[PDB]
Design a protein around this ligand. Sequence first.
Ligand code: HEM
Ligand code: HEM
Ligand code: HEM
Ligand code: HEM
Ligand code: HEM
Ligand code: HEM
Lengths: 229, 228, 230, 230, 230, 228
Amino acid sequence: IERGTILTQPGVFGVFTMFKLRPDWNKVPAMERKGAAEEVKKLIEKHKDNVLVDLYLTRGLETNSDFFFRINAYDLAKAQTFMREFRSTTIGKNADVFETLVGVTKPLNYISKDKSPGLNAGLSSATYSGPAPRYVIVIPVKKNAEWWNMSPEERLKEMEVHTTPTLAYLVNVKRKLYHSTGLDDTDFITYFETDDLTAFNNLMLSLAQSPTTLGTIHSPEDVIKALAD
Amino acid sequence: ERGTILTQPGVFGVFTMFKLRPDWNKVPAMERKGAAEEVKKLIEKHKDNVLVDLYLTRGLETNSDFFFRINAYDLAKAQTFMREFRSTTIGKNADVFETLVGVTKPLNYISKDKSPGLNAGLSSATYSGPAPRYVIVIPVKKNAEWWNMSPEERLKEMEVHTTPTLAYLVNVKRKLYHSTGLDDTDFITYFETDDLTAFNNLMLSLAQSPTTLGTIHSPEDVIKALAD
Amino acid sequence: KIERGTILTQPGVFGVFTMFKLRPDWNKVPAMERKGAAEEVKKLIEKHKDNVLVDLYLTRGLETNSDFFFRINAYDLAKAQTFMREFRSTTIGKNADVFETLVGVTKPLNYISKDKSPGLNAGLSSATYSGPAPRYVIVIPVKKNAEWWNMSPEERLKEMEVHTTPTLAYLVNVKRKLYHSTGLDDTDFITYFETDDLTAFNNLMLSLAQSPTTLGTIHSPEDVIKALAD
Amino acid sequence: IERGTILTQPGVFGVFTMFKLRPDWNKVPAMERKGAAEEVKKLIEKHKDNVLVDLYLTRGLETNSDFFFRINAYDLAKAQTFMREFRSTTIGKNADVFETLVGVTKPLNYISKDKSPGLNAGLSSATYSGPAPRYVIVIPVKKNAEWWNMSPEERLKEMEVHTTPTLAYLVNVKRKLYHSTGLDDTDFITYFETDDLTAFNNLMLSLAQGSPTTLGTIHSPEDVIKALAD
Amino acid sequence: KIERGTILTQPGVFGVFTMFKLRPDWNKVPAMERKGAAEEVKKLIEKHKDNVLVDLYLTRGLETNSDFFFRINAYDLAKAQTFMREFRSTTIGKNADVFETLVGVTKPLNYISKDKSPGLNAGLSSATYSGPAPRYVIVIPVKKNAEWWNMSPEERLKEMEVHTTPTLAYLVNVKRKLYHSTGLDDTDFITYFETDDLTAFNNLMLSLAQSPTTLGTIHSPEDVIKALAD
Amino acid sequence: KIERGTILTQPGVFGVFTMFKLRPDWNKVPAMERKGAAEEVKKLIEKHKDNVLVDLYLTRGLETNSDFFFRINAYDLAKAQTFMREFRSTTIGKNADVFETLVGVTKPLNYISKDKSPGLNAGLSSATYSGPAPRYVIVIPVKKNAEWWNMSPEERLKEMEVHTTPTLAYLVNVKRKLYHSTGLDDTDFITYFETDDLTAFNNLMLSLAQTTLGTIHSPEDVIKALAD
Ligand code: HEM
Ligand code: HEM
Ligand code: HEM
Ligand code: HEM
Ligand code: HEM
Ligand code: HEM
């Protein structure tokens, strides 16, 4: 598993699990809590060849969660095994699952070279340029009957409308699409990274013209350390 | 056995989704490590009564950690197995999230008689992948507009349903149970695949009912995974 | 005197249906105390042999929201109440929550009578259950809407004739019993079915299609309690 | 306070409180439980010049309650005091309030001698002729904006439609109307007693051609509590 | 300093209404601790003699969702907050949950003023309460919909004249006080009533017919607490 | 480094609003531990002097669903998050549930700018707050519907001019601050008001028609009020 490769390929599974710490986490012995970070660190190293692990901090920014994982894997069952084993961890045993989202990466359906070459070239010509992102946004999306009724040609035109004002934001915002229909009770999981939350608000407003999860990006052991305190 | 019962009409399916109680972690480790054997013995005890499938959802689902599919010629035998499972060490430490009851039936619409072309397509398509690693279960309830329609109208719609889905039969196994009158839904749809991208594409094909996604294992392995 | 064949066949008979869900602390009841629960219930039913008819059904393993339910039939509703109240004082009764209680009363035919609908009435009499002893029970409470009650008696009779036409055939393999609940409970009817053939029942419901369903199995009361004590 | 007088006068307050026994009632020492009936009996006697007290048994017939009181009083504050004091009682401390309904008795608004003499005469010529009633029914009723929009003349005609088929039932169903608008979150509390629940089902169907129904049995207060101590 | 007859009669006065329900563990508070609760509240009110006007009302025995409620009037809302916060630290305050909190301010007449509606305004002044001291309180919060706010001032005035016309008659029997809440709370108005005659109040509401209601009884604060300690 | 008068005045500033309700077990915390809670919070705010601006408000006695709330302003949202998470590890923080969390960012004028609406923009500049320091705070989150977002920019501008016209008068008595939330939270705006005159605020809301209410104190005073 190489981070730069797996995050770039079709057919990759994404499993997103949002956790809320149970009230009795405060009652776990401080020493046992202080060992939780290293336990998680070792679990991630144990699964180094199995899955890519991202862990984000939402505590202080979200009412319904304290942290969430994004697991990427070529084999969904490996993602499942990691998540299952995390739940047997000291902190895992003291956290409720708020939300679990399963999706899979796919090739471009609409804005491809063949179907929409102008906007496709814009998609490739745009490259992220600021500092390493501090922030993550996850938004699941379910499309309605009206969307699915539409012809492929009509949906392509709508996706060209989607893509036109959003290309400018790629210098500032990283995006990643996972597809969920049949795998979960949603159609897509949209995933964003940014250092510039004002740009992200402008992006969303450009699009306006679900449950949002906002968190911060850290090493997994730092996230756990922040939750042990 | 397995190959026969999963292939006949008049066969009952009982799907029960379980969520481990928080006090499962508090069960002594030795008692938890004996849970798998206990379930294995119960299944062997009912070898001549029911077919048992047990699946792992923990790590992929918020609302369940495992679920059973029981197939039986006699519904009461499926009930007996499920009740006895719930008296098991792990069973006593799990809440029932969902219970679905349905029965297998002959083809209503895409039969040789009513729809010979698509019926032939249904028979000529054969699963060609490796042993499936994933299971999907989706209960379906149809609305009054569906039931209002004529048999001919419903047939036309089922022909629309079948047309784009035949392609996926090489890649995805499907099994239909009928539930009207037996439960608070109309159908239980059941799928196995090794290729979840294919399954996603299949559902999208149809788009153009809460979903349970789990993983296929031997029963003792599922319990072993939950004991840890 | 309660004769099963007589009481289940008369008008003015009260039905009380109570669905129970075992509390989590039932597993914590000493195993010997649990093993004595069946006999306690058996004796209670015996005690009330002249007061009420008792049916007890097993729903555990088939239903999320209940483990068992009673159907009590009685000439005197107060007697059904007394039995149910005394059941809740039993070992198993003390360890079970009430999920649902339905009260209804048996009545003469309102629509498909000799007088109003003689053809279909004759079909109702000529149809006889011919299967083995039923293994399965289905209970469905029904509330009718404003539109139904708005309709004329003549319009409601025509609809009941529509209801009866495709269902007569199913009487060879499905037993039915109607209770009327309006004013006695928050529903209008309790419908009650017995069958050995759940494929026939699914077909029956589909024939009709063209509130919540309780499915259970029929056993002696002590067998149901024994099954729950394990 | 005279039962026959207070139940027959305008300006009389009704307070209905439905109670559900808490799970820890079973854990109350059996002798403490067996003393509960006498405690309630003495409270009722202490208030014999303050309020009329009725207590009814719903356990075994209702999911959401085990018993309920109807308190009648000339003075509402006295009904409040009794109920408060009941809640301090051994059984009162082990019971949750499911529902509280407050209403007041009033003169005839519609079917009066002046406004509807024919039906008014029928109302007075009908007399309850059954045995002492064993069953109570309570149904709260809230009317909608359409009702209140209607003219007094239109509402009177509707009330004449209400009364026409129901007069027949007065030989075996007792009725009492309380008015609740402004006093509670409903418009009326309807209260019925009968020995014949078949007739009551027929009555409600006659009418059919916000409102949860409470069905219970009529007993002495001490017998209701004794039944609940068991 | 604060005079009851003055502050209850001025614009710009804040009302804070807080409805409390006793926690189950109130019964478990030592009896002597509970019997000292009344004096503790009495002293708190005395402490804030110059800060707020305090009314306390008993709803237990009449309401499912509350046992008592306060109405605090004050020139300074922050002082009403301070009292309520300090009450919540009392023995009984520590053993009660807040069910509802309503905040409003008193204002001059918007509609039925001398300038806008002189006839009805004169009727408003010429009517005075003539009963015995009121024993009963009613509180009803009111939220008006978009249709109301869309209407012109002239249209709203005409509606308020419709409101006032039949209600003037009831001012001999019913005290009224209006608080305005828009922006301060999630409702538009807090309406407050006192009466000794609940039949008149029912008649009044029916006159108007042609949110949730809280009914309680008026007492000294110490008597209300004493009533809850028992 | 952070200056109150500066950070409250700039675009690109993040606001984090978190409403807390004290757990029933707060009364069971030893009185001396409760009495030290105020200084603990004071020290935490001091430690983050250069990272965030902290406002703490008292809602106990005025709200059913909360006892206190924070408004954190910061150039860096992550620093607001750090303060809030460290607050939650405090003695009082450990004994309070989060009822509500609102995230937003400050932005330049979108509608009532000099360019787009010069007359009303001038009125915005000319109406200033007078009178005593505000005693009261009001926070109202706002989500706009699909009808709003499908309107043209011109149509939305006209609406915002309708919004601004009767509200200018209230700026002598009410301070206002807008935060933008779309994409950062499940709402579109966080509106924030301070006033000493709640009658004026009532009239303002009524003018618009044609909610969290709290009181402003130093952070240690709010905590001291809650320790009692
Ligand atoms: C950062 C700027 C963005 C760019 C450049 C962008 C571009 C695109 C492109 C090119 C696709 C087509 C994928 C394909 O061909 O299969 C797509 C799909 C999609 N986008 Fe974005 N997007 C952006 C931001 C967003 C945001 C903020 C959302 C809101 C959650 C969003 C929601 C979606 C969804 C739900 C789809 C799948 C649509 C479908 O296949 O039916 N996007 N986007
Ligand atoms: C794997 C590819 C699939 C194929 C080849 C297929 C084919 C069929 C056929 C031939 C029938 C008619 C059975 C009869 O005549 O009685 C049917 C029924 C049905 N299918 Fe599928 N199907 C597929 C996937 C799916 C999926 C993904 C769903 C979504 C949950 C679904 C939902 C249903 C339902 C609810 C019925 C019962 C319809 C009714 O009787 O009204 N199917 N399918
Ligand atoms: C087993 C086959 C069935 C037969 C032969 C049958 C026949 C009848 C007849 C003759 C009546 C009218 C009795 C009268 O005149 O008073 C009736 C009533 C009724 N049936 Fe069935 N039925 C069958 C199955 C069902 C099923 C499966 C349901 C669904 C729950 C159902 C629901 C009802 C209801 C709610 C009524 C009350 C009608 C009313 O008085 O408004 N029936 N049935
Ligand atoms: C037992 C046979 C019944 C008779 C003889 C009867 C008769 C009457 C009469 C004469 C009135 C008008 C009282 C007046 O003028 O102020 C009335 C009112 C009313 N009745 Fe009945 N009734 C009967 C049963 C029922 C039943 C079963 C209900 C259903 C719950 C019911 C609901 C009501 C309600 C809600 C009102 C108040 C109507 C209003 O003033 O808006 N009654 N009844
Ligand atoms: C006791 C007899 C009553 C009289 C004489 C009366 C009279 C009035 C008057 C004169 C006003 C106008 C205040 C102004 O100009 O600012 C008013 C407002 C109002 N009244 Fe009453 N009222 C009575 C009872 C009631 C009742 C029973 C309710 C129902 C809860 C009620 C609800 C309201 C409300 C919500 C307003 C504010 C309306 C608004 O400003 O939009 N009133 N009343
Ligand atoms: C105190 C007097 C007020 C004045 C002078 C005022 C003025 C303004 C102005 C000029 C804008 C446009 C900002 C821009 O152009 O980007 C605005 C936006 C907004 N105001 Fe107010 N306002 C006041 C009170 C209120 C109140 C009481 C509320 C109710 C909660 C409110 C809700 C909003 C909202 C939600 C927006 C965002 C609108 C959008 O961009 O779609 N305002 N206000």
